[PDB]
Write a protein that binds this ligand. Sequence first.
Ligand SMILES: *[C@@H]1O[C@H](CO)[C@@H](O[C@@H]2O[C@H](CO)[C@@H](O[C@@H]3O[C@H](CO)[C@@H](O)[C@H](O)[C@@H]3O)[C@H](O)[C@H]2NC(C)=O)[C@H](O)[C@H]1NC(C)=O
Ligand SMILES: CCC[C@@H](CCO)Nc1nc(N)nc2cnn(Cc3ncc(C4CCN(C5CCOCC5)CC4)cc3OC)c12
Ligand SMILES: CCC[C@@H](CCO)Nc1nc(N)nc2cnn(Cc3ncc(C4CCN(C5CCOCC5)CC4)cc3OC)c12
Ligand SMILES: *[C@@H]1O[C@H](CO)[C@@H](O[C@@H]2O[C@H](CO)[C@@H](O)[C@H](O)[C@H]2NC(C)=O)[C@H](O)[C@H]1NC(C)=O
Ligand SMILES: *[C@@H]1O[C@H](CO)[C@@H](O[C@@H]2O[C@H](CO)[C@@H](O)[C@H](O)[C@H]2NC(C)=O)[C@H](O)[C@H]1NC(C)=O
Ligand SMILES: *[C@@H]1O[C@H](CO)[C@@H](O[C@@H]2O[C@H](CO)[C@@H](O)[C@H](O)[C@H]2NC(C)=O)[C@H](O)[C@H]1NC(C)=O
Ligand SMILES: *[C@@H]1O[C@H](CO)[C@@H](O)[C@H](O)[C@H]1NC(C)=O
Ligand SMILES: *[C@@H]1O[C@H](CO)[C@@H](O)[C@H](O)[C@H]1NC(C)=O
Ligand SMILES: *[C@@H]1O[C@H](CO)[C@@H](O)[C@H](O)[C@H]1NC(C)=O
Ligand SMILES: *[C@@H]1O[C@H](CO)[C@@H](O)[C@H](O)[C@H]1NC(C)=O
Ligand SMILES: *[C@@H]1O[C@H](CO)[C@@H](O)[C@H](O)[C@H]1NC(C)=O
Ligand SMILES: *[C@@H]1O[C@H](CO)[C@@H](O)[C@H](O)[C@H]1NC(C)=O
Ligand SMILES: *[C@@H]1O[C@H](CO)[C@@H](O)[C@H](O)[C@H]1NC(C)=O
Ligand SMILES: *[C@@H]1O[C@H](CO)[C@@H](O)[C@H](O)[C@H]1NC(C)=O
Ligand SMILES: *[C@@H]1O[C@H](CO)[C@@H](O)[C@H](O)[C@H]1NC(C)=O
Ligand SMILES: *[C@@H]1O[C@H](CO)[C@@H](O)[C@H](O)[C@H]1NC(C)=O
Ligand SMILES: *[C@@H]1O[C@H](CO)[C@@H](O)[C@H](O)[C@H]1NC(C)=O
Ligand SMILES: *[C@@H]1O[C@H](CO)[C@@H](O)[C@H](O)[C@H]1NC(C)=O
Ligand SMILES: *[C@@H]1O[C@H](CO)[C@@H](O)[C@H](O)[C@H]1NC(C)=O
Ligand SMILES: *[C@@H]1O[C@H](CO)[C@@H](O)[C@H](O)[C@H]1NC(C)=O
Lengths: 768, 768
Amino acid sequence: ARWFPKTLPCDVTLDVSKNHVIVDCTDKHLTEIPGGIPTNTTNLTLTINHIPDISPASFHRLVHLVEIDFRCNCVPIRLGSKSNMCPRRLQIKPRSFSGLTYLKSLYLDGNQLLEIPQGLPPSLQLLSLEANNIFSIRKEQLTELANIEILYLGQNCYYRNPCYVSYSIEKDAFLNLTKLKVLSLKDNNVTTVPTVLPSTLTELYLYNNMIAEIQEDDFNNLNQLQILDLSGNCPRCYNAPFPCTPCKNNSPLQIPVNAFDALTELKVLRLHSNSLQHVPPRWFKNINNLQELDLSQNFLAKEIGDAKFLHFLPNLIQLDLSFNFELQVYRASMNLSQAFSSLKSLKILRIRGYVFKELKSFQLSPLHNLQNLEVLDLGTNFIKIANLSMFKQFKRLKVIDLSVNKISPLYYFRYDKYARSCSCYKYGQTLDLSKNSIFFIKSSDFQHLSFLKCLNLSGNLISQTLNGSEFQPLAELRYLDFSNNRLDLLHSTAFEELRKLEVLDISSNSHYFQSEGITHMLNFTKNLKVLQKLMMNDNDISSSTSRTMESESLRTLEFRGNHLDVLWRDGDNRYLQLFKNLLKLEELDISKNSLSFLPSGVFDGMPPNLKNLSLAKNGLKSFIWEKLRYLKNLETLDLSHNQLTTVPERLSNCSRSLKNLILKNNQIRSLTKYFLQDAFQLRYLDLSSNKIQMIQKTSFPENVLNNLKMLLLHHNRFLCTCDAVWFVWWVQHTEVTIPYLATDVTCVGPGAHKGQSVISLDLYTCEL
Amino acid sequence: ARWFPKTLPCDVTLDVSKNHVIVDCTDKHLTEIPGGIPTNTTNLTLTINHIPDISPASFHRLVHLVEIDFRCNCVPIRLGSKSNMCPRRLQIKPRSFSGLTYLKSLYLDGNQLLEIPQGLPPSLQLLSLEANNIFSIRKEQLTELANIEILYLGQNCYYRNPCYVSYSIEKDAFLNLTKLKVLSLKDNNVTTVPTVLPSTLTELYLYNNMIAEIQEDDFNNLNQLQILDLSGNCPRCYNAPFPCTPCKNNSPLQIPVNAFDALTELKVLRLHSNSLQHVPPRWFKNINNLQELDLSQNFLAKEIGDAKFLHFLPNLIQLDLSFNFELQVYRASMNLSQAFSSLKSLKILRIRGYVFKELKSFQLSPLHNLQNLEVLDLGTNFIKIANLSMFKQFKRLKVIDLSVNKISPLYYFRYDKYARSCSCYKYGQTLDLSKNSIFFIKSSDFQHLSFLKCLNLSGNLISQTLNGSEFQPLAELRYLDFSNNRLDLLHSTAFEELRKLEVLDISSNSHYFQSEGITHMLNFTKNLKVLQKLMMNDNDISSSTSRTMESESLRTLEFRGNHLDVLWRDGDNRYLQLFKNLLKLEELDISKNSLSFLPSGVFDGMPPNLKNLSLAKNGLKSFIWEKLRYLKNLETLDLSHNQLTTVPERLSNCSRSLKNLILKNNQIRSLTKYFLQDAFQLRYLDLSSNKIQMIQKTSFPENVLNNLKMLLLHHNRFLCTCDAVWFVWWVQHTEVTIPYLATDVTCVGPGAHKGQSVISLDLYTCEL
Ligand SMILES: *[C@@H]1O[C@H](CO)[C@@H](O[C@@H]2O[C@H](CO)[C@@H](O[C@@H]3O[C@H](CO)[C@@H](O)[C@H](O)[C@@H]3O)[C@H](O)[C@H]2NC(C)=O)[C@H](O)[C@H]1NC(C)=O
Ligand SMILES: CCC[C@@H](CCO)Nc1nc(N)nc2cnn(Cc3ncc(C4CCN(C5CCOCC5)CC4)cc3OC)c12
Ligand SMILES: CCC[C@@H](CCO)Nc1nc(N)nc2cnn(Cc3ncc(C4CCN(C5CCOCC5)CC4)cc3OC)c12
Ligand SMILES: *[C@@H]1O[C@H](CO)[C@@H](O[C@@H]2O[C@H](CO)[C@@H](O)[C@H](O)[C@H]2NC(C)=O)[C@H](O)[C@H]1NC(C)=O
Ligand SMILES: *[C@@H]1O[C@H](CO)[C@@H](O[C@@H]2O[C@H](CO)[C@@H](O)[C@H](O)[C@H]2NC(C)=O)[C@H](O)[C@H]1NC(C)=O
Ligand SMILES: *[C@@H]1O[C@H](CO)[C@@H](O[C@@H]2O[C@H](CO)[C@@H](O)[C@H](O)[C@H]2NC(C)=O)[C@H](O)[C@H]1NC(C)=O
Ligand SMILES: *[C@@H]1O[C@H](CO)[C@@H](O)[C@H](O)[C@H]1NC(C)=O
Ligand SMILES: *[C@@H]1O[C@H](CO)[C@@H](O)[C@H](O)[C@H]1NC(C)=O
Ligand SMILES: *[C@@H]1O[C@H](CO)[C@@H](O)[C@H](O)[C@H]1NC(C)=O
Ligand SMILES: *[C@@H]1O[C@H](CO)[C@@H](O)[C@H](O)[C@H]1NC(C)=O
Ligand SMILES: *[C@@H]1O[C@H](CO)[C@@H](O)[C@H](O)[C@H]1NC(C)=O
Ligand SMILES: *[C@@H]1O[C@H](CO)[C@@H](O)[C@H](O)[C@H]1NC(C)=O
Ligand SMILES: *[C@@H]1O[C@H](CO)[C@@H](O)[C@H](O)[C@H]1NC(C)=O
Ligand SMILES: *[C@@H]1O[C@H](CO)[C@@H](O)[C@H](O)[C@H]1NC(C)=O
Ligand SMILES: *[C@@H]1O[C@H](CO)[C@@H](O)[C@H](O)[C@H]1NC(C)=O
Ligand SMILES: *[C@@H]1O[C@H](CO)[C@@H](O)[C@H](O)[C@H]1NC(C)=O
Ligand SMILES: *[C@@H]1O[C@H](CO)[C@@H](O)[C@H](O)[C@H]1NC(C)=O
Ligand SMILES: *[C@@H]1O[C@H](CO)[C@@H](O)[C@H](O)[C@H]1NC(C)=O
Ligand SMILES: *[C@@H]1O[C@H](CO)[C@@H](O)[C@H](O)[C@H]1NC(C)=O
Ligand SMILES: *[C@@H]1O[C@H](CO)[C@@H](O)[C@H](O)[C@H]1NC(C)=O
């Protein structure tokens, strides 16, 4: 179909709507900028490569460039790879970017640059220089950036990329940048807030620095500021998973009471990890539109009980007061101030790491009349006693998170959560009791909680024989996550009281299935009349008392990580019809079941409307492809990560309906003579990570290839001799999507073509 | 330096003491018996091969053969592999074994033979024909076996190898075999006990058959019988993991009261899975020397309460009454008859699967004065309540097994446990409480059990902050298995009360290490003054409050399955000396820790007496070999299953003490010019499963190679051209142990030599 093959090692996407010709060369092991890049290229990306220098020859013909994303070409030694370390820093010669008069964005992050690149065009609106060795900002170096709007200079002096000296900023360095909206000097060893900053700033990030005190003048002219982040200045270092140095004498970040007076348009204020002991109400005197306030990782345990500053925050949407506990005090109860009732517009409230022994209904009374409250997160508190019926006065809430607690009958601790690199809530009211010490359950525990749509009891100590009476009040429940427990299916009436249950997860409940002679009733699904999805993964199921699983509604069953090779032992025909009576079953995942072979009767004993079947990671050494005729509605068949050596003689003769066939990571050395002859329903074929040497025209007919949405042939043992004249010509001139063509579709031999891509091959010698 | 290379594909071991020249060809993918087998061969083994026939040419010149082990050459379709199924049964032509006048043993198991091979020598003492299609025994066919002593004919007609008809045995078929000591007709569809059997029988096995009734005459002349096994005749099929057909009307195996009268020398009687409801005392009237009695998988729950037959068994050593529960009764208590006190010589008593709610001290009173009692196993009983202090009257016992129970504050079910294929008890008194519902522990729980030397609390629900007061009475404890629990190391005083503790297993206690911000005190080892081995595997440890683990006695630490890549994050120098203060540490396993690279300071921060270190399954892309100089007492270094591409330039310049280096399963394509030059201390090197093409004398000097105990070079990409002239010659003429030489040390190329072994290569063309 194509007259000229695309030999460039980059993915070229055209977007005529926004007029962008995008060339993506991300992680293509390039030591030079490749030749033949389109002249109309607007967005050129060369991220994760080993190009040692940039010169006027680099973007000589690409005058229409609007963005250059030249990131991580010489990433610092500690942040980057150790197998392929950068020998020398990126060298930018003069007049490299001056000729590109249309350049709006330029990312030169992770390149070990010592200074700000000079000679940049006046049309540049965004400049990113993160993870470099630029630790001294001078006014003369910023003169070229007259029209810059976004400027990232962070991660230039911190534990992962040290500079061994304090960050220096000349007085009024950013002042004459009259269009600067976003400025970020995060993770830089900055000692004072740089002044005078331009009034047009909308976002300012000075987090994870050595700023010990804020002056009252530091933000006197930032009347258009929306986001301010002064986190990690005098940090709370208890259990920090990174080198953490707190301020001397355990003092907090000293912020004057009138420091935020000029910030009338402030929406987000992040004071995370600042060792604050008090929050003065005077801070929020002129801040009426504050929507997000993060006060996590401070010493505000006593302040949570008084918190007079909450009366000055009626438009606050998000409030975070996590990990504020007194280092050596295990409180008896949580004391929330009555001022929390004045937070009329609050939707999310997170108070993790408060650390208290007992939660009571009256302790959450300041939160009763907060009509817009959606999320109440009291996780990681080590709560031992909590009457779950107290949440009957919180029916309007979407999520009630009590995860990681001791109730019985990396986000807040990571150094930089916005670091740049080179679920059942949709069902309704969720009550998360995951990672808890609940060992026994009864109907009275879930009393007055009939409104719940999802209950996550994952990671608990429940080692009970459920008989259909432990969740009687949970009538509206649609999702129950019972994973990482010790479910004992002695009675087939387990879970029957949950009549509106659509999804049940009983994965990683292997305990009773590991010991011999224990009764297991897998026929418990018959009583659940509206169950759509069931997961019983990693349960090590090798035996069952019941021979059949019945259900008139189940559409998806995940039986991964079990021992169906033991149940379907050759000669034992008892469990071959285990999934047959699941009449509406469309998806069955029976991967990771040690099935070296499939006995006769497994295909006949499959349900009638089965569409997607996965036999992946089983170690299958043989497969009777002709047996796929029994599976009349088969669309997807996943046989990845197996030891299969051959493909069927004629795939169309094995299955009339098969659309998607995944054979990746197998021992296939050759395809049959007429493999895809008349396979008209086939739309996707994966033969990657195999040992295929030759592919002929008869095996891949054109009428079948043209209907394919994608064909994967990468990581194969292709021999590129004159016998492979058809395959090399077809691959080069086809319009079929074949991923990784110019990076992992390689000739293993003969001699000269070893390690060469098939897309850049020229077999003119085979026709003289 | 051998003069003639050993090209035979079998391991030839010489034993001049017993004149045995052993030739082992087990699993060598042979389609013919290989040529050049030594003439003095006594023991020839050809197990797991595809040799289609045996003829007089097979053992023509091997006249000194005392044993032929020709097993699993045509294994039945259901028992064997499906990728390489046998096309036709093994064909034995006439006069194949008649010429071998010294043949004493002949195993022809798993070959689909239809009849007993005829023309065998008169010197044969053992003949095994298991897993074949011989289901009709005639007297004329056993004429040739006049001097046979051992004869296995089982597994010829069962679910894994059916015959579709009952097993037929002619009357007095084995009677004239006047030397027959062992006879086994197990798993054969046998309907009646064959009569008259020869009086010289010492062992008889008729288990897993259709014998519904025993006649009083069946064993009237077996006065020399020691072992009798009539198990699996009228079996108990509840939760059987194999096709199980019980006798009609739930009737047991009908055994007359005087059936065992002539068995005066009987030592072992196995009546497992016979659906017995009563055990008449009259059975053991003339059996005074019975030592083992297996009555498991029967319906003897009520009989355990009366058991008058135990008065006729004073010399019984082992008694098994497991899985005798009434299918639908959960008893309140265990009722053991007072007749158990008359078992003076009993050492092992197993009563698993009795199924009862509460164990009380007085219920075990019949076992108080049994002075020789060593093992009391009451596992798989679902016991909910049991005062552990009751075992104070059982100090003499070696093991008290209460595994798989509900106590809170494949052997019995496999078809044939003797099927032929093609721990802390040494410390002292063990109390096994594994796989139980114990969620909380205190000193009073282990009161009066100071005598215990090992306590296995593995697989329990303990989610407690141990502070050194939960095991105060356990003063003599040397081993504590606390694996598969939820250990919370809040206090560094955990386990300190166990002062004589030598081994501590806290593996698979990942729960609290998975959630952020939780305090973890790994320095708890300092208080344990005699701890020799500590295992903290699969705990997902990514953070720690303490920076150093201290111990003046710990010799072995297993830290597998953790996140040392997170603790030793580049730039974070805080946990690099975590294992340094473990001064007597000789073994450290830090495999499976996601360590793609080792930061600088890990080697310097290692303990001084570290002998063996494992960095296996880490995904290591690079390794600074020169850093091994810090580890001055290093003998073993295991870097298996990693992504290392190169070996050091000079291994001698890296380590002066390294004896064993394991580099299996890596991406090494070539060795450095002078790799093992002057590395005289090396005694073991593994370079198997790598991509090495060439090995020259400069990289592998002979003075260093000759001192090696073993050198593994299998599964490599060896190119066998004239440049590899030295490697092929050395490998052919060396006495150094290289395993898998004539099976997996193969030439990948060029053309002609593809798939050929290097041992059978002839490079005479490279020297003309
Ligand atoms: C962040 O900036 C501070 C400076 O504001 C850096 O601190 C300084 O770091 C250097 C190098 O580690 C220290 O110098 C050394 O001092 C020792 C002890 O006197 C001496 O033996 C060495 O030869 C060397 O001179 C210096 O004392 C230290 N100053 C202070 C006040 O701490 C810090 O390294 C920077 N961190 C990062 C990650 O960039
Ligand atoms: C080795 C034991 C294997 C298995 C055997 C179960 O058949 N037992 C068990 N299997 C599993 N997975 N968990 C447990 C927990 N405890 N038990 C013992 C047990 N608990 C209850 C009964 C009921 C007794 C009363 N019965 C009736 C009640 C009235 O309407 C008719 C049934 C229901 C079972 C019988 C019983 O054992 C005999 C278990
Ligand atoms: C997110 C919480 C992380 C961590 C914080 C503590 O490291 N807490 C915890 N870490 C871990 N692994 N487990 C648990 C279980 N409960 N808690 C809460 C808790 N329990 C006890 C105390 C004692 C209070 C009294 N104190 C005494 C010591 C001696 O001088 C007198 C006071 C000992 C600790 C303090 C405390 O939290 C403040 C845990
Ligand atoms: C090509 O470069 C332009 C200019 O940098 C990118 O434009 C940004 O697009 C996003 C999404 O529409 C906007 O939010 C930004 O405001 C745009 N930036 C500027 C400076 O206009 C564009 O995304 C790039 N194309 C691709 C595919 O990455
Ligand atoms: C070689 O064959 C002889 C004869 O079958 C084997 O001898 C048996 O050895 C075991 C101990 O290993 C004794 O218990 C048997 O009584 C011996 N049988 C006979 C008939 O004497 C010998 O083990 C074989 N050698 C090897 C290495 O397998
Ligand atoms: C065990 O022997 C019995 C006969 O004693 C076999 O039973 C017959 O099997 C055939 C084939 O399935 C049936 O047509 C007969 O009706 C069966 N007869 C009876 C009485 O059951 C049985 O198949 C044999 N089993 C094995 C595993 O060899
Ligand atoms: C809550 O804390 C305040 C101090 O911040 C204290 O005065 C008050 O008594 C506390 N409330 C309760 C119920 O303990
Ligand atoms: C739990 O709280 C409910 C009221 O919400 C009450 O009826 C019930 O008795 C309480 N249960 C316990 C065990 O305190
Ligand atoms: C339950 O919580 C666990 C974490 O504790 C999480 O992995 C899982 O996805 C949750 N369940 C649902 C349905 O979201
Ligand atoms: C269900 O189990 C509970 C708790 O053991 C019990 O009270 C109840 O009677 C049981 N109901 C049935 C029908 O088995
Ligand atoms: C499950 O199977 C058992 C027999 O093994 C039967 O008694 C029980 O009624 C079955 N349960 C259902 C829901 O079909
Ligand atoms: C087919 O089912 C598999 C699971 O077996 C799933 O991962 C895949 O997304 C499904 N594809 C379609 C098109 O439904
Ligand atoms: C398979 O192909 C053969 C030969 O054309 C034909 O006889 C047979 O009916 C086909 N079966 C199916 C299911 O297509
Ligand atoms: C033990 O069982 C016998 C019947 O076998 C019965 O007579 C006796 O009362 C039982 N003992 C107890 C304590 O229940
Ligand atoms: C456990 O038994 C001992 C006697 O061996 C007794 O002193 C103790 O009180 C008992 N404890 C309980 C909880 O029954
Ligand atoms: C404890 O029991 C488990 C099985 O429940 C076993 O794997 C482990 O080896 C036992 N511990 C010891 C020290 O033998
Ligand atoms: C140890 O913990 C127990 C509770 O398990 C407590 O009674 C005791 O006072 C504690 N001792 C110390 C020294 O902390
Ligand atoms: C463990 O370290 C903590 C500080 O992190 C210290 O308080 C405690 O004494 C240490 N324990 C031991 C046994 O060294
Ligand atoms: C590992 O070290 C132990 C001593 O701690 C030693 O006995 C053992 O032989 C070593 N393993 C190997 C493979 O050398
Ligand atoms: C050992 O290696 C170091 C580092 O490459 C090198 O400087 C030194 O010369 C080597 N030792 C010898 C004896 O060559």
